[PDB]
Design a protein around this ligand. Structure first.
Ligand SMILES: Nc1ncnc2c1ncn2[C@@H]1O[C@H](COP(=O)(O)OP(=O)(O)O)[C@@H](O)[C@H]1O
Lengths: 62, 62
């Protein structure tokens, strides 16, 4: 419970999401690919982490 | 670009029923209409449910 108060930090992991966002942050990214990446990340979140489609989406995003 | 969407909007306006459009172009996963079994985390209902929710009626123009 002490952790729940602060230990969890109530912060979503989003390791792949945050990593890719920081990776593309420095780059001068076009808006079309920006929205495409946003949609791909939304789909990745919508899917599970133990399915082939998840790995395919991660590979395409990489 | 012929106005078919505009035609449907005008028909909804004339008929006194709410309007809604759905995109089924190249779609493959029926989930977007069937949602998901709602026991997996993050499951969302199909677009028809959202259409009913926003339209606030059971007799809109789909
Ligand atoms: N007969 C018409 N009279 C006036 N406007 C029209 C007519 N046909 C099309 N439009 C215009 O087309 C637009 C919508 O086109 P849209 O429904 O997107 O075409 P499509 O159905 O081919 O995608 C509207 O803004 C409307 O002004």
């Amino acid at each position: 419970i002490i952790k729940k108060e602060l230990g969890l930090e109530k912060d979503d992991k989003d390791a792949i999401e945050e990593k890719f966002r920081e990776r593309l942050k420095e780059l001068v990214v076009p808006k079309h690919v920006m929205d495409v990446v946003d949609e791909e990340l939304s789909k990745l979140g919508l899917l599970d982490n133990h399915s082939s489609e998840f790995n395919v989406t991660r590979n395409y995003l990489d | 670009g012929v106005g078919k969407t505009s035609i449907a909007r005008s028909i909804a306006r004339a008929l006194n029923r709410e309007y809604f459009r759905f995109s089924v172009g190249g779609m493959t996963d029926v989930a977007e209409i069937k949602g998901h079994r709602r026991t997996y985390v993050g499951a969302m209902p199909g677009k028809i449910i959202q259409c009913l929710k926003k339209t606030k009626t059971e007799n809109p123009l789909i």
